[PDB]
Design a protein around this ligand. Structure first.
Ligand SMILES: CC[C@H]1OC(=O)[C@H](C)[C@@H](O[C@H]2C[C@@](C)(OC)[C@@H](O)[C@H](C)O2)[C@H](C)[C@@H](O[C@@H]2O[C@H](C)C[C@H](N(C)C)[C@H]2O)[C@](C)(OC)C[C@@H](C)C(=O)[C@H](C)[C@@H](O)[C@]1(C)O
Ligand SMILES: Nc1nc2c(ncn2[C@@H]2O[C@H](CO)[C@@H](O)[C@H]2O)c(=O)[nH]1
Length: 300
């Protein structure tokens, strides 16, 4: 035989327990710390994504995320995963075959490709898609049992994350003062919350052949919270010029803005160091921890 990374017999049995008959090519990504991700061919001739929780604490998150996606399906003008299997041992959905807005080889630190800066179709359709997401009524989020943060709770969560990093790591003094100044800067913070994706960047956005946004994936961080959460990565990837274009079109599409939104988004992006450090800490992974500590101690 030939040794292969995927355990085809175990994967077949797992899928079959949930009404899916695997047959044909599959691909496996075991780099995720919480899930194994397999793209598999099923006897319907279609590819399906198998999202396999690794541990009980991850399995616990399946049921609430399933309620989120069930609520979002009809309320977004783009596709989201259709979790036709959702249980503690397996999530599975038909693959949304459109490409992500970037392409990267598993394990690599460098993408092969990112949708270009000058793609007006991408920029525009991402802005309108984001306005549509942020227009989902909070009532619908409450009815779906989502995590809800008022503006005060949103700001408290950021404070709590900063304080946890301060307890566990040694942070550059200027970084600490930046975060504290932000937390104390009333004019930066929004006076409302919206449904956010929570982990939104080009790698979780799907596009058609023309580069028009057609879907979003990986909704595990979705909640009602600060809208700027979903704009930080756009600034990170497309710069201030990209952000300026996003905010103009987002507002024109009905997105609610506030005067210091662009500033707030930059502060949220800086806060990404906190998010990364807590991910590292909770992961127990020494390589991620090494990177986090180095970033935190470094002057920005
Ligand atoms: C351009 C392409 C590059 O993407 C980015 O830089 C995004 C803008 C990031 O989001 C930025 C912006 C941000 C707002 O997230 C969208 C912010 O939270 C974050 C930490 O970094 C990522 C997505 C981060 O992931 C996020 O890291 C979190 C700690 C946990 C998140 N999730 C729950 C599993 C996860 O998706 C990550 C750390 O990159 C550096 C992923 C890590 C594997 C890499 O270094 C990558 C190879 C990348 O540099 C990239 C793919 O080449
Ligand atoms: N194009 C596409 N990629 C997916 C889909 N589901 C998962 N992926 C990929 O697998 C990762 C983990 O879910 C994502 O970040 C994507 O890289 C999908 O339906 N379509």
């Amino acid at each position: 035989t030939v040794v292969t990374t995927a355990d085809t017999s175990q994967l077949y049995a797992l899928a079959a327990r949930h009404g899916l008959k695997l047959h044909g090519p599959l691909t496996v990504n075991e780099l995720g710390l919480d899930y194994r991700i397999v793209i598999a061919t099923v006897d319907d001739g279609r590819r399906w994504v198998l999202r396999i929780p690794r541990r009980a604490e991850v399995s616990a998150k399946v049921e609430p995320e399933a309620r989120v996606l069930a609520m979002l399906k009809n309320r977004l003008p783009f596709a989201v995963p259709d979790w036709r299997v959702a249980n503690a041992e397996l999530v599975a959905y038909p693959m949304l075959e459109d490409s992500t807005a970037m392409v990267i080889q598993p394990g690599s630190s460098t993408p092969d490709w990112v949708v270009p800066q000058d793609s007006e179709v991408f920029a525009e359709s991402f802005a309108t898609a984001l306005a549509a997401l942020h227009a989902v009524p909070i009532s619908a989020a409450v009815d779906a049992g989502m995590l809800i943060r008022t503006p005060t709770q949103a700001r408290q969560k950021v404070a709590d994350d900063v304080d946890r990093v301060r307890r566990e790591f040694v942070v550059n003094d200027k970084r600490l003062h930046r975060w504290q100044r932000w937390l104390d800067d009333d004019s930066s913070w929004p006076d409302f919350s919206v449904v956010v994706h929570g982990d939104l960047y080009v790698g979780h956005v799907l596009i058609d052949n023309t580069e028009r946004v057609s879907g979003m994936i990986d909704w595990s961080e979705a909640r009602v919270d600060d809208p700027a959460i979903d704009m930080a990565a756009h600034l990170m990837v497309f710069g201030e010029e990209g952000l300026a274009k996003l905010l103009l079109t987002y507002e024109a599409a009905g997105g609610r803005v506030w005067p210091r939104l662009a500033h707030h988004i930059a502060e949220r992006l800086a806060f990404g160091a906190v998010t990364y450090a807590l991910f590292a800490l909770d992961s127990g992974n020494e390589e991620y921890l090494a990177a986090a500590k180095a970033q935190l101690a470094a002057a920005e």
